[PDB]
Amino acid sequence: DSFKEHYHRVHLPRRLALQRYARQQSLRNAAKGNVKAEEVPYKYNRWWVNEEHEFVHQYAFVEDPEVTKAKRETLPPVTRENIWKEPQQT
Amino acid sequence: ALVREQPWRLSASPALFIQVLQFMALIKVFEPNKWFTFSDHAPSNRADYRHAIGVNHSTAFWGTGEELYDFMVELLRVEDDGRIPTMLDLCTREQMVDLLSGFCGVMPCGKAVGDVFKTITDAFLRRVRNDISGPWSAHDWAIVERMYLVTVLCDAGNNEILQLLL
Amino acid sequence: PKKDRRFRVQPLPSLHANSLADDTPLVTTTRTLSPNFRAFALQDGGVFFTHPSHEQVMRVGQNILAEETKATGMTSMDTYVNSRIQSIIAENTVENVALSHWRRRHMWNLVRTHGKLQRHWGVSDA
Amino acid sequence: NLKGLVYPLPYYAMWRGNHNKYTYNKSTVCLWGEGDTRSMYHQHYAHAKCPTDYGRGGREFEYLTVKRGKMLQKPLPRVQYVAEGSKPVWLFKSWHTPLSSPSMWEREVQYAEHTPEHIGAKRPLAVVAPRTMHRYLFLMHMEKVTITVSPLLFGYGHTIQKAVLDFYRRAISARSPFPKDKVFLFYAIDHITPRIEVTWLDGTSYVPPVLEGASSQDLIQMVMEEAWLAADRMAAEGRVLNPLAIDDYKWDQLVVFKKVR
Amino acid sequence: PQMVMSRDELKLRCEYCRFEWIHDTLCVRCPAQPSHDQREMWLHSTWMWGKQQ
Amino acid sequence: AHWERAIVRKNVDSAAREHGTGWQHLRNELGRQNVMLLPRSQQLLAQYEPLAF
Amino acid sequence: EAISHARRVSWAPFAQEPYFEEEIEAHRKHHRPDVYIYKYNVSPTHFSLR
Amino acid sequence: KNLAWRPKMSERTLEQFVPLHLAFPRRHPNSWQERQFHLLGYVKWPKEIGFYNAGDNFELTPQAAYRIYKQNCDETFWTRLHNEKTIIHLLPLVEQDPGTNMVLVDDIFRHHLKRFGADHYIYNAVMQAAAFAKDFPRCEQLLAEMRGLGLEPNAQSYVNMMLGARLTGKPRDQAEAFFREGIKTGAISAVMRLDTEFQMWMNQLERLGSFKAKVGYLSVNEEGASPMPRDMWALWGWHRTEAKFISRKQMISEQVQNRVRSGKELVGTVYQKARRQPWAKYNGMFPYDYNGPARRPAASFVDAPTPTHNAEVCGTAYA
Amino acid sequence: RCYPSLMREKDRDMYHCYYPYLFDHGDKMSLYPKIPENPREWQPEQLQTTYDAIREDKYDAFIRLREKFPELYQDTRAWDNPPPFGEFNMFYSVRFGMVGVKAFTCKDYDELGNQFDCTAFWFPDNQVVKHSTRNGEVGTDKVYVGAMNVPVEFHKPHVAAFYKAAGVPVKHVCAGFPITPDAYAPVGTKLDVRHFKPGQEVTITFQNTAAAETYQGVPVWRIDYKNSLIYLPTLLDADVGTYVRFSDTINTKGLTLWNEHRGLPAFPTFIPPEDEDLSKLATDECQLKSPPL
Amino acid sequence: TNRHFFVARANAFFSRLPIARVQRSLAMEAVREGR
RNA sequence: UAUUUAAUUUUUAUAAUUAAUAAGAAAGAAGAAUAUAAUUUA
RNA sequence: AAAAUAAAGUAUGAAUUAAUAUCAAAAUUUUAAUAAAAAUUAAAAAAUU
Ligand SMILES: [Mg+2]
Ligand SMILES: [Zn+2]
């Protein structure tokens, strides 16, 4: 029983509860008949130059749950023949 | 089924709304700690505890009744006066009582949530004040009385219903 | 020698030196129920205070609570609190058993099961 | 110290010391322009940053951001104050071109909408100006400098009269690069707030704003800066401009220090 | 750079030498002839309480 | 002897905190007006007779 | 190369001073006239409180 | 070796990450805000008199400003800029009721014209007022009075001509004419061709639509009403040296610096020999950064008359 | 070296952007900071910019120079055209491995005379048994792969129950793979062996001869996709019959495993063509092999 | 480490693949290319 | 022998939201023992 | 370091040792000489080898 694992002992269930309180938003944005995944804006400034003058890049990856729900639900199409019949060059 | 891929089904028929709510109160989903407790003198924390070296990864926090209960609260969460809740003007009075006792029975406290309780009770009195003028029976008193018993149980006593019965 | 673990009184707002002047007490209590405590002067040199009773003060509290909750409605905590004010005004006795006990024993009213084993207000020989 | 899902990107977490182990904050420690400084005012970051674009603070920095929901790619901005169908003139700016020519400082794409026909201008004007301190008047693109003072107006102590005539004193003094035959002084009869008028090779005449409490070098530098603006302006007409004997911005120079022993 | 004992022991040796502030620590920098650089000796730019008094 | 009078002081002080003052003034002006209520008694009044306190 | 859009001369084929004040166009920022509107500065280009 | 706490990086590598100019986890508590308000010599005024609006700016109320005028008309310190500032303060009142507020503008006008023979400021100001009051022929009349008087109509005067020509509901080519005449005159210096730049001006004025209109900056009426700015350490600059709220005996000193002649440094020029270097200056905390802003006597109102209508609420004074 | 370049958050602002900096007004993106509609909240010494000829001309030049020279600027197209979801994002995609068995040991030669000691692994039945996303938190998703079909009476009575609930045939063994949302495959998917390309490097987790071990670099040698073997050039310290958990080694020192030069994986799962039937197909013609090391 | 994935072993099922057949098959492929 | 470390408490379907640098019915042999989960076997 | 021998075992059953409270884990300074003595912060479960 140090400081920190007692801290998380108490607070991680509270973080879970708090994000549950975050999930109910979508829920009354469901119940009233709206169906929308709340969108995340695309950020055009991901390319930058720092003080030592070199190229720095930021990676933003956006997960689409309507794609995921389709991804798990049905098979992918047949693997193209360029893939397995030719090896991966080392 | 009832939340993600078929959101309309609970709103359409209150019957299974109450049935699901009561089953969900019967197993106690909001105190999983007593799923693992063999002696009530020593309450077991199996559900609420995790350590980083891996104890209780399998018995860890299972969101179980989370989505359901939050959803079927938010079906009753229409506080907007623009449109009244669509199921509550669909329910039988006895049904209103039984789903109030549903909400009152699910929570670990044994007390209903304020918005829900207010909503249902205020929806009930506006039916009682209507139906007492029309065709009425002694059984329809049973509905009212075991409404007031729940109303006392959750600790907001109704002065109006009590002064109706007395 | 050990570190002192006795309880410490909270700091209190510093005086502006106005208090130093006589006829100005350095206790400042001007509060909601203040005007109701009426001071009378006894022949002894002692004083005589007239105050509203216990249940009157708590009834005032109840009125203020209801009057703040008329707008947004009454939340569960408000419900429980109003219940307890309402009980302690009418008390006439002392309460020694947990408030939840009655609810725990009466839970069968709330959650009804199938009708085979369903429990009623009379049970035996039926 | 990585556990759980690790992304194929080569080093994202390496700067916070190789781990993913907190990540649930929306709030970090911040210098100016860092995240939670959205809501505070600053000169630089009011015009240099969008206040949706503030990421997390110091060494925990976003190299990799994974969020869920739909993407909004909002369309790029369309450029103001030009009609469609308009055919601009195109320029080639290069590092090959040194900074000594005005061909570095102007619009790269050049429309006919942005070309003033007020002045004779074939190509539009520049957007960026060079900055130095002009210690002296040197004849740049000017052909005449007229200084008109009415002596009737009289004052004791420091006054604008003193400033303008100090402008003159500096113009005609021994160390002034300005050729001293083209500085003209006029005594006027009726009560003139002394003005300085410089006429260029365009026939255009500029009068600097002699302000209350003006001094000698203010007018000098005003004249010189406006002289640059006018060199460019005349350059817009198609005049062929001779190179300046003295360079006020030292482009071709380095700061040189004297020796040791 | 050489660390002077206090601010009084700090002089400007050349024509181009300047007084500058290194985070509340007064110092002298010459853009030419860097051997003229002088620091006032004082606390580190980053110090905690237990770590530095 | 010290622990317990510390407890008593704490209770009377918090009971004064509910009224927007504290032990620090209350002691002085129970001294000034010559009331002579021992702090133990002030605790008894704070807990069993809030109106009198 | 390593150069940013700002400070880049053309797309055709710093630590010592972190903050800037934004530049108005060259012919605009040489003498920049007052125009009273109701206690604001209005130009063809910029606004201000003054 | 937790690496969330004690990472594998040397202190030499890591000491760049120590914030010395720290922004968000702020060092100024709330209790100080009022204190640091008092030491700067600022005074809390009632809502009628003025207030610190949404940008924490102290704006002086109209009908408050006019009373300040009517007390200070003949005062020695009252300069000709104070008059035009007063008139500028009266403009929303000018629009929302032109009948009873143009009389005020004319009072200031006549009084100004007899305290000083004539001024450029005053004519700009009142033709702006007449522009907002939508009396256009008044604008031409006034301009003719300028030219007849020997006054050279200013660039601003032409912008006022354009404004009056616009919001009086009169067509383009009556504004266009003002712009072209103004640019022939050598008042407006426009770098672009006439058409596009007139487009620019009109596009600025359409953003600036009036106090009575449905779309415009001036048409926005909401005002954060505060007696005190809710951040006292607020910044117009970069550094803490450049803070927005400075002491009054400082704001005397900078005004003294402004209205005294330019012998050391450049006025009007874009060079500015002394370059802004906030990062170069002292970075460190003073004892008032710890113990709080120094205590000064709270600014008090002696012998104020009793508050009649204390129950009544002040209406937002935009009228 | 083993650190990337350090860029602070303060340092990303209009003057540091590689491409033109864009401000977001929320219905529209512009290059001018949003001018607040309430004019009285304008701060002093602030220029509200409605137009700038300096920053708009560079944008003007940039855009045109893009459409006018599309062949030079194709990398610039990354700015305006982000990859949509799925579609095998090189940096964002993590797929699952499968559960093998250490079958036997063998020896091969490459093109030159070189003795290799191969270890041959067997992939008896690999099916996606379970999906677990933990409370919907991002980057938390697992796919559970089972192997080695096993009679009804084998497992303890609580294991069989699990398999009955899933619907998947009863397996000897299950292992979880953390993966990204795009890499999902439906429950009960038969996994083939050529899910693993013969050129790649594989992460291997197995039991030592007696704790768990992880080998993070090991290249694939050869694949029998008839008998569902896979060959590897290593001698493991492991009992024959040990269940071995496979994964793709997702980065080798700054280099991604999958890239245009090196190659591309069959992404969520491999699927066989409809026209092939392995019951007609011999062992030798069923062979796949690496390029020479 | 005592978990189920690690402790359980597949020995008993090894008749499901012909080990001896594949070794000889790659012997054939050894003499076909001539190692 | 006390502390201290290291291992174990005898298959955990599964592992890591944090600390520091993880656990389902039971004991003979874990083998019916000569490495096949029966080499046909009276 | 391979080979031979010996350690869970049923039965018998000693000896050194013993001021102790269910114990005394980690760090810091102090105190008349290690200081398992103080104080403070802290973070030592059970059994077996
Ligand atoms: Mg005693
Ligand atoms: Zn030097």
Short mmCIF file of N, CA and C in Angstrom, two decimals, chain A residues 28-89:
data_model
loop_
_atom_site.label_atom_id
_atom_site.label_comp_id
_atom_site.label_asym_id
_atom_site.label_seq_id
_atom_site.Cartn_x
_atom_site.Cartn_y
_atom_site.Cartn_z
N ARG A 28 -28.63 9.95 -25.07
CA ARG A 28 -29.84 10.76 -25.30
C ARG A 28 -29.75 11.41 -26.68
N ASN A 29 -28.61 11.23 -27.36
CA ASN A 29 -28.54 11.61 -28.76
C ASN A 29 -28.91 10.41 -29.64
N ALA A 30 -29.38 9.35 -28.97
CA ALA A 30 -29.89 8.10 -29.55
C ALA A 30 -31.42 8.00 -29.35
N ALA A 31 -31.78 7.98 -28.07
CA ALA A 31 -33.15 7.95 -27.56
C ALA A 31 -34.13 8.92 -28.23
N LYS A 32 -33.68 10.13 -28.57
CA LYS A 32 -34.59 11.12 -29.14
C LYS A 32 -34.75 10.94 -30.65
N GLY A 33 -34.07 9.93 -31.19
CA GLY A 33 -34.25 9.53 -32.57
C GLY A 33 -33.11 9.92 -33.49
N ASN A 34 -32.18 10.70 -32.97
CA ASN A 34 -30.99 11.05 -33.73
C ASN A 34 -30.06 9.85 -33.81
N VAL A 35 -29.45 9.61 -34.96
CA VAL A 35 -28.37 8.64 -35.01
C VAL A 35 -27.15 9.31 -35.64
N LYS A 36 -26.16 9.63 -34.81
CA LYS A 36 -24.93 10.23 -35.30
C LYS A 36 -23.73 9.82 -34.44
N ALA A 37 -22.64 9.43 -35.09
CA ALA A 37 -21.37 9.29 -34.39
C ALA A 37 -20.78 10.68 -34.33
N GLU A 38 -20.47 11.16 -33.13
CA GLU A 38 -20.10 12.56 -33.01
C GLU A 38 -18.73 12.74 -33.64
N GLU A 39 -18.67 13.59 -34.65
CA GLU A 39 -17.52 13.61 -35.54
C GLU A 39 -16.34 14.36 -34.94
N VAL A 40 -15.16 13.91 -35.33
CA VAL A 40 -13.91 14.55 -34.95
C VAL A 40 -13.34 15.29 -36.17
N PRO A 41 -13.05 16.59 -36.00
CA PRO A 41 -12.58 17.40 -37.13
C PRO A 41 -11.20 16.98 -37.63
N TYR A 42 -10.98 17.05 -38.95
CA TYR A 42 -9.67 16.77 -39.54
C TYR A 42 -8.73 17.94 -39.32
N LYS A 43 -7.48 17.64 -38.98
CA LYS A 43 -6.54 18.70 -38.68
C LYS A 43 -5.51 18.88 -39.79
N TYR A 44 -5.62 19.98 -40.52
CA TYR A 44 -4.69 20.23 -41.60
C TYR A 44 -3.29 20.59 -41.10
N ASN A 45 -3.11 20.97 -39.84
CA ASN A 45 -1.73 21.23 -39.49
C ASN A 45 -1.18 20.05 -38.73
N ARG A 46 -0.63 19.12 -39.50
CA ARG A 46 0.17 18.03 -38.97
C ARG A 46 1.64 18.03 -39.40
N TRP A 47 2.02 18.96 -40.27
CA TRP A 47 3.38 19.01 -40.80
C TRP A 47 4.09 20.23 -40.29
N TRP A 48 5.25 20.04 -39.67
CA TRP A 48 5.89 21.14 -38.97
C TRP A 48 7.41 21.10 -39.08
N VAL A 49 8.03 22.25 -38.85
CA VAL A 49 9.48 22.36 -38.81
C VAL A 49 9.95 22.91 -37.47
N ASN A 50 10.81 22.16 -36.78
CA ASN A 50 11.23 22.58 -35.45
C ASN A 50 12.45 23.50 -35.45
N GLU A 51 12.96 23.77 -34.26
CA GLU A 51 13.98 24.80 -34.07
C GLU A 51 15.35 24.41 -34.63
N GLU A 52 15.59 23.11 -34.76
CA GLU A 52 16.84 22.63 -35.33
C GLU A 52 16.71 22.48 -36.84
N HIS A 53 15.56 22.92 -37.34
CA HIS A 53 15.25 22.91 -38.77
C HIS A 53 15.27 21.51 -39.36
N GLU A 54 14.35 20.67 -38.92
CA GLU A 54 14.10 19.42 -39.62
C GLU A 54 12.62 19.09 -39.62
N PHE A 55 12.25 18.13 -40.45
CA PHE A 55 10.86 17.80 -40.71
C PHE A 55 10.26 16.96 -39.60
N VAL A 56 9.21 17.47 -38.98
CA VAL A 56 8.50 16.77 -37.92
C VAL A 56 7.06 16.53 -38.31
N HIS A 57 6.61 15.30 -38.11
CA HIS A 57 5.28 14.92 -38.53
C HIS A 57 4.46 14.35 -37.37
N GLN A 58 3.18 14.71 -37.34
CA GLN A 58 2.25 14.21 -36.34
C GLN A 58 1.24 13.28 -36.99
N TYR A 59 0.96 12.15 -36.35
CA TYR A 59 0.04 11.18 -36.94
C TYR A 59 -1.30 11.19 -36.24
N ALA A 60 -2.34 11.52 -36.99
CA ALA A 60 -3.69 11.52 -36.48
C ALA A 60 -4.48 10.43 -37.16
N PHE A 61 -4.97 9.47 -36.39
CA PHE A 61 -5.72 8.37 -36.97
C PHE A 61 -7.11 8.33 -36.39
N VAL A 62 -8.09 8.37 -37.28
CA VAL A 62 -9.48 8.45 -36.89
C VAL A 62 -10.21 7.13 -37.08
N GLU A 63 -10.75 6.59 -36.00
CA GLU A 63 -11.47 5.33 -36.05
C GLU A 63 -12.93 5.53 -36.40
N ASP A 64 -13.39 4.79 -37.40
CA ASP A 64 -14.77 4.87 -37.83
C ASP A 64 -15.56 3.66 -37.37
N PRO A 65 -16.44 3.84 -36.37
CA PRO A 65 -17.19 2.72 -35.80
C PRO A 65 -18.24 2.11 -36.74
N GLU A 66 -18.67 2.86 -37.75
CA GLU A 66 -19.61 2.29 -38.72
C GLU A 66 -18.88 1.43 -39.72
N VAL A 67 -17.58 1.69 -39.88
CA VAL A 67 -16.71 0.81 -40.64
C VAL A 67 -16.36 -0.42 -39.82
N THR A 68 -16.06 -0.21 -38.54
CA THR A 68 -15.68 -1.32 -37.68
C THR A 68 -16.83 -2.31 -37.57
N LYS A 69 -18.03 -1.78 -37.33
CA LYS A 69 -19.23 -2.60 -37.22
C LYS A 69 -19.49 -3.41 -38.48
N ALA A 70 -18.99 -2.92 -39.61
CA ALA A 70 -19.08 -3.66 -40.86
C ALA A 70 -17.90 -4.60 -41.06
N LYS A 71 -16.83 -4.35 -40.32
CA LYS A 71 -15.57 -5.06 -40.51
C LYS A 71 -15.65 -6.36 -39.79
N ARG A 72 -16.26 -6.30 -38.61
CA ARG A 72 -16.42 -7.49 -37.79
C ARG A 72 -17.56 -8.34 -38.27
N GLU A 73 -18.52 -7.71 -38.93
CA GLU A 73 -19.77 -8.38 -39.27
C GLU A 73 -19.64 -9.31 -40.48
N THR A 74 -18.84 -8.95 -41.47
CA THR A 74 -18.71 -9.79 -42.67
C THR A 74 -17.27 -9.98 -43.11
N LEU A 75 -17.03 -11.06 -43.85
CA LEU A 75 -15.70 -11.40 -44.35
C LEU A 75 -15.14 -10.34 -45.28
N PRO A 76 -13.80 -10.23 -45.34
CA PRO A 76 -13.16 -9.44 -46.39
C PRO A 76 -13.24 -10.18 -47.72
N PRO A 77 -13.05 -9.49 -48.85
CA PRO A 77 -13.02 -10.23 -50.11
C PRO A 77 -11.73 -11.04 -50.27
N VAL A 78 -11.62 -11.79 -51.36
CA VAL A 78 -10.52 -12.72 -51.55
C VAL A 78 -9.18 -12.01 -51.68
N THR A 79 -8.18 -12.52 -50.96
CA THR A 79 -6.83 -11.98 -50.99
C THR A 79 -6.25 -11.99 -52.40
N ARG A 80 -5.81 -10.83 -52.86
CA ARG A 80 -5.28 -10.68 -54.21
C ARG A 80 -4.01 -11.51 -54.40
N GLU A 81 -3.79 -11.96 -55.64
CA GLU A 81 -2.78 -12.96 -55.95
C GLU A 81 -1.34 -12.42 -55.98
N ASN A 82 -1.19 -11.10 -55.91
CA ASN A 82 0.13 -10.48 -55.88
C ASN A 82 0.79 -10.63 -54.51
N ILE A 83 -0.02 -10.98 -53.52
CA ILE A 83 0.43 -10.99 -52.14
C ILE A 83 1.17 -12.28 -51.77
N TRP A 84 0.49 -13.42 -51.75
CA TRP A 84 1.12 -14.64 -51.23
C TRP A 84 2.04 -15.37 -52.23
N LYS A 85 1.70 -15.35 -53.52
CA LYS A 85 2.47 -16.11 -54.51
C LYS A 85 3.83 -15.49 -54.84
N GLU A 86 4.04 -14.25 -54.43
CA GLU A 86 5.36 -13.64 -54.52
C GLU A 86 5.80 -13.34 -53.09
N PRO A 87 7.09 -13.53 -52.80
CA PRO A 87 7.49 -13.39 -51.40
C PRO A 87 7.66 -11.93 -50.99
N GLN A 88 7.98 -11.73 -49.72
CA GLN A 88 8.34 -10.41 -49.22
C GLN A 88 9.86 -10.30 -49.27
N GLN A 89 10.37 -9.36 -50.07
CA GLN A 89 11.81 -9.21 -50.21
C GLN A 89 12.39 -8.60 -48.93
#
